[PDB]
């Protein structure tokens, strides 16, 4: 159980001129061509996603990628101001692949319903993770893993109102956001299937039931905060987009075709640091992205709940939270 430094590897292209690809190409290695798994037999081992360096190291690598590829014109701080060249550029994120150095292997924790906190009866080491997509966003987890058995409710204490619940959802529902072709070059729109939503919130209901018994699950819209975290909000082709979710948090929901609102916004809120990031206005033409919710992020309501209902609401913001979201089953030890 010891901390290393990590390496990455990738699939990056050197002729692509993709930031993540260039970023990667620069940083990180080619992906293991032929990588081994070996299951230790009849061996327990404790994992904890909520204390795990290799979270603070993917969030590192994240920042970098992104003061690479996503330059603000100008950046606002408490204790500084910072005008820049901010050139628009390509943008699609790519798998990453985490890596433990000579002396160290990396635990991978293969029960299928693994909470994240406690022992683990089935564990193999390998020399790097899955690759897994830094996808950066508030309230819906896209394009990552699904759980293999089940929905999986990941808390650090689910008692604990104010900590934030990971769900990893066993089905994806898809999702489509798109600025079109053009009058505002600001509006855009999501599409998403009522009938796959609400059968997603069904399951996940009934999973936090098991927690919350005699209790009634409702899900209900975000109480207030920045405009980050208060709608689902991504970076789709290298522009910010703000989606309504009202229409998706709700205890009544239409099995027809759902449509959100969304803007693309140039002001934003950091998550690397506080403080503002502002970008150029969007580029021309059709931006869409067509992504796998695959996960929640969900925060539960404080407080005597006089009518018997829990009440949680879609949240995020720390995109360490993204990240354990995929690392929750790896842990680095030193071999001896
Ligand atoms: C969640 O994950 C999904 C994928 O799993 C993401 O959706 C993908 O988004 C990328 C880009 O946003 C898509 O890739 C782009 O596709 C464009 C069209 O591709 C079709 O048409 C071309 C041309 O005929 C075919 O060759 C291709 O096979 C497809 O049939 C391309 O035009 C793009 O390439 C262009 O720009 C690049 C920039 O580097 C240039 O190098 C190229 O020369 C070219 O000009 C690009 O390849 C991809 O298709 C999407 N997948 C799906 C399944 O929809 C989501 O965006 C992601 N969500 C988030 C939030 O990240
Ligand atoms: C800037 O903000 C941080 C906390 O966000 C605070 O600790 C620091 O004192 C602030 N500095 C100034 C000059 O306001
Ligand atoms: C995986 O571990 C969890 C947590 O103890 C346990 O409830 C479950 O039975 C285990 N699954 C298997 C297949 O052993
Ligand atoms: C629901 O999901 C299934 C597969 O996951 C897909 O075939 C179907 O088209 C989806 N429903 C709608 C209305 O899009
Ligand atoms: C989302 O839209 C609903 C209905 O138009 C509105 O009441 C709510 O204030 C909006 N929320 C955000 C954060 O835009
Ligand atoms: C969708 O909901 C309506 C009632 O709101 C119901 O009549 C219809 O059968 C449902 N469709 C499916 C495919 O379940």
């Not at 909470?115 to 950066?136: E, L, M, W, Y």
């Not at 409710?153 to 898809?174: F, G, M, P, T």
């Not at 970076?235 to 027809?256: K, V």
Request: hydrophobic letters at 35%.
């Amino acid at each position: 159980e010891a901390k290393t430094t990590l390496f990455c590897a990738s699939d990056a292209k050197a002729y692509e001129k993709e930031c993540h690809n260039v970023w990667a190409t620069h940083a990180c290695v080619p992906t293991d061509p032929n990588p081994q798994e070996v299951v230790l037999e009849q061996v327990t081992e404790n994992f904890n996603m909520w204390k795990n360096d290799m979270v603070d190291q993917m969030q590192e690598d994240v920042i970098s990628i992104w003061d690479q590829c996503l330059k603000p014109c100008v950046k606002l701080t408490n204790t500084s101001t910072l005008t820049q060249a901010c050139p628009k550029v390509t943008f699609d994120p790519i798998p990453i692949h985490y890596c433990a150095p000579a002396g160290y292997a990396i635990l991978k924790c293969n029960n299928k319903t693994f909470n994240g906190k406690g022992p683990c009866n089935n564990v193999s080491t390998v020399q790097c993770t899955h690759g897994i997509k830094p996808v950066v966003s508030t309230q819906l987890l896209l394009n990552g893993s699904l759980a293999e058995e089940e929905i999986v409710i990941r808390s650090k204490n689910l008692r604990d109102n104010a900590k934030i619940i990971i769900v990893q959802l066993q089905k994806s529902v898809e999702i489509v956001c798109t600025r079109p072709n053009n009058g505002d070059i600001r509006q855009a729109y999501c599409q998403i299937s009522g009938r796959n939503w609400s059968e997603a919130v069904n399951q996940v209901k009934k999973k936090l039931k098991e927690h919350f018994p005699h209790k009634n699950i409702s899900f209900q819209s975000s109480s207030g905060g920045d405009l980050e975290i208060t709608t689902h909000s991504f970076n789709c082709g290298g522009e910010f987009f703000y989606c309504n979710t009202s229409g998706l948090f709700q205890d009544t929901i239409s099995n027809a075709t759902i449509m959100l609102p969304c803007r693309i916004k140039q002001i934003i809120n950091m998550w690397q640091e506080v403080g503002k990031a502002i970008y150029a206005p969007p580029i021309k033409g059709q931006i869409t992205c067509k992504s796998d919710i695959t996960g929640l992020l969900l925060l539960r309501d404080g407080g005597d709940t006089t009518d018997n209902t829990e009440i949680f609401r879609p949240s995020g913001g720390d995109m360490r939270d993204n990240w354990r979201s995929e690392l929750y089953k790896y842990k680095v030890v030193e071999i001896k």
